Structures are given as structure tokens and as C-alpha cells.
Design a protein around this ligand. Structure first.
Ligand SMILES: O=C(NO)[C@]12CC[C@H](CC1)C2
Ligand SMILES: [Ca+2]
Ligand SMILES: [Ca+2]
Ligand SMILES: [Ca+2]
Ligand SMILES: [Ca+2]
Ligand SMILES: [Zn+2]
Length: 316
């Protein structure tokens, strides 16, 4: 909407207070004009009709329980925008400052969140499996990274290409979590998963097998569930990415870590310059090797570590 840019205050899903960029025109709207062509957050009002209504508030204070998922969807979209702009010089998900739209309170008891091709959608969870999923910065950045992938490599969401697509979202969701530097880790969804159980998550990048996901190509899922295992076989690539960043010895193969920032540069370059819609794991290795070569040189430690990491997970 047309209006004047303002700054509200509210509390997110985990009870933390944060400032949020709003727009005033009679009401205060969750419309951040400071980032690109805007970040817009909507109330789906427990329905599945999208986007719902642009979030309007009478006093620019967002401390009601019902407000909390909107606060976090809005704020963490901004953090994710900032990460891509400041770290990779990418302006929103299309590189041309496309507006980022999110809807919260999607359906009833909905234990998921997703990019639908045009916008972000967040369930509130059923209170047992999940609390409102926008409370997880890695969730928000994971799904917004699907938008980045769709506008760049275009990896198809099935089989090995789809597992790469998923791993890219886990990698950059985790790197955004580290960027924001609040309780960062290499697990996915821990802030909103199972409020009754401490120390778990949906997936681990450092030890995918902690939750039953494969950590070596020989252990890959070969059936048809989950679009050919896109959230399962992502563990193989997630593990390689973890090893590139942090190092380790895995099935007897030693990897010298090169740190998160270089991991991010290597995989961002692979995603945007070398991967294609049907890339498989072997082609991802080649893309990462070439990316690290462009950035650091053929004889760099960085290139050697990329090779070791894919060796360690059995991807040639
Ligand atoms: O895997 C996922 N998407 O493909 C999810 C997205 C929301 C939950 C956190 C990560 C599941
Ligand atoms: Ca209010
Ligand atoms: Ca965390
Ligand atoms: Ca995490
Ligand atoms: Ca938990
Ligand atoms: Zn995903």
C-alpha cells in the first residue's frame, strides 16, 4: 500500500522482542519499504486461500500471541534479504529486488512451511510436532532459498537434483542462522520442532544419521517416497558441505575445513553459475570444484577440501 515508512515493535514466537519495519496508512501494515521493492506479510486467518490480507495493526505494537508468527515471518525475511544482499550482492530472490510476500496462520494445526512458487506460507503447527514455523530463522531462509534456486539453477524437485535443491536450502538456511548469530548450529528446525523435547530437530547436517538420513552415497534412498528422497538424500550433500566448512574425518577420509564464509561463496557460485535443472550429485561435485577454482585457484586448499569432502561421502 501507499503510506509512510515506520518502525513497530513486537515479540516473536520464542518471546523475543524485536523492531520491525512497517508502513502507516490509517493502520500500521507489515510492509517493510527499506528492502528492495518491499517485504509484505499477510494473515491467512487459519484458511488456505492465499495470500490472505496484508497484516494491519491499529497501534504498531505486535505483542499479542496471534501476532508472533507474523513478527518473525516479517523480520526473518528481512534478515534473509540482508544476508543475500550483503554477503552475495544478490537483491532479493530474483536478483532484481522482487517483493517478498509471506502468509502466516495458514490452515489449522499445519505442521509445515513452504514457498509456493510466488510467496512464503507458514503453518502454526499443532503445538506438539511444531510451534509456528516462522519462529525458525533456518526454516524461513531454507524456504526463501528455494525461491533463489528456482530463479537460478532451477533444480527439479525429484531424485538427485531435488536432493541437491534441498541441501542448498539447508546450507543457506544454516548460513543465515549463523549470520544472525542467535544460537547457531548445523541442525534444521530446532527452534520450532517438538516444544516438549529438548535437543532434537528435523535434520542434522553435521551428522545426518542422527535422524536416520544417509551420510554416504552408498546409503542413498532409491525408492519413490518423498519425490525420490529429496529430504533424505540431502543428507549426503549436507554432510559434504559441513565437512567443507568445519572439516573432519568421515568413513576414513580426512577433510580440512575452510570455514562457513568460503563454503557460502563456493556453493553460491555453483548454484548461480554451474548447476542446471537436472544436475546430479556427480555434477554438483564438478560445479563445486569449478567454483572453488574460480575463486581460490586450481591448487588452493579450498579446491582440495571440496574434493576430499565429496570423496568422504562417496560422490565422484
Ligand atoms: O524440508 C523442508 N522444506 O522442503 C522444511 C520446510 C519447513 C520445515 C523445515 C524445513 C520442513
Ligand atoms: Ca497492536
Ligand atoms: Ca539454532
Ligand atoms: Ca538450525
Ligand atoms: Ca524440540
Ligand atoms: Zn525444502
Amino acid at each position: 500500500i501507499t503510506g509512510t515508512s515506520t518502525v513497530g515493535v513486537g515479540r516473536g514466537v520464542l518471546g523475543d522482542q524485536k523492531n520491525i519495519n512497517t508502513t502507516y496508512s490509517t493502520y500500521y501494515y507489515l510492509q517493510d519499504n527499506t528492502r528492495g521493492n518491499g517485504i509484505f506479510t499477510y494473515d491467512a486467518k487459519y484458511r488456505t486461500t492465499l495470500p490472505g490480507s496484508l497484516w494491519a495493526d491499529a497501534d504498531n505494537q505486535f505483542f499479542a500471541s496471534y501476532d508472533a508468527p507474523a513478527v518473525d515471518a516479517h523480520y526473518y525475511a528481512g534478515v534473509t534479504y540482508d544476508y543475500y544482499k550483503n554477503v552475495h550482492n544478490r537483491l532479493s530472490y530474483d536478483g532484481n529486488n522482487a517483493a517478498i510476500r509471506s502468509s502466516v496462520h495458514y490452515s489449522q494445526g499445519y505442521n509445515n512451511a513452504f514457498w509456493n512458487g510466488s510467496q512464503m506460507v507458514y503453518g502454526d503447527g499443532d503445538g506438539q510436532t511444531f510451534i509456528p514455523l516462522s519462529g525458525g530463522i533456518d526454516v524461513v531462509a531454507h524456504e526463501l532459498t528455494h525461491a533463489v534456486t528456482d530463479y537460478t539453477a532451477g533444480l527439479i524437485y525429484q531424485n538427485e537434483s531435488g536432493a541437491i535443491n534441498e541441501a542448498i536450502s539447508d546450507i543457506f538456511g544454516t548460513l543465515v542462522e549463523f549470520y544472525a548469530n542467535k544460537n547457531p548450529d548445523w541442525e534444521i528446525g530446532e527452534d520450532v520442532y517438538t516444544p516438549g523435547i529438548s535437543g532434537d530437530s528435523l535434520r542434522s547436517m553435521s551428522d545426518p544419521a542422527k535422524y536416520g538420513d544417509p551420510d554416504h552415497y552408498s546409503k542413498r534412498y532409491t525408492g519413490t517416497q518423498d519425490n525420490g528422497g529429496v529430504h533424505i538424500n540431502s543428507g549426503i550433500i549436507n554432510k559434504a558441505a559441513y565437512l567443507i566448512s568445519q572439516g573432519g574425518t568421515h568413513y576414513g577420509v580426512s577433510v580440512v575445513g575452510i570455514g562457513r564464509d568460503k563454503l557460502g561463496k563456493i556453493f553460491y557460485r555453483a548454484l548461480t553459475q554451474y548447476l542446471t535443472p537436472t544436475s546430479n550429485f556427480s555434477q554438483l561435485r564438478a560445479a563445486a570444484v569449478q567454483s572453488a577454482t574460480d575463486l581460490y585457484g586450481s591448487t588452493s586448499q579450498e579446491v582440495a577440501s571440496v574434493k576430499q569432502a565429496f570423496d568422504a561421502v562417496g560422490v565422484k
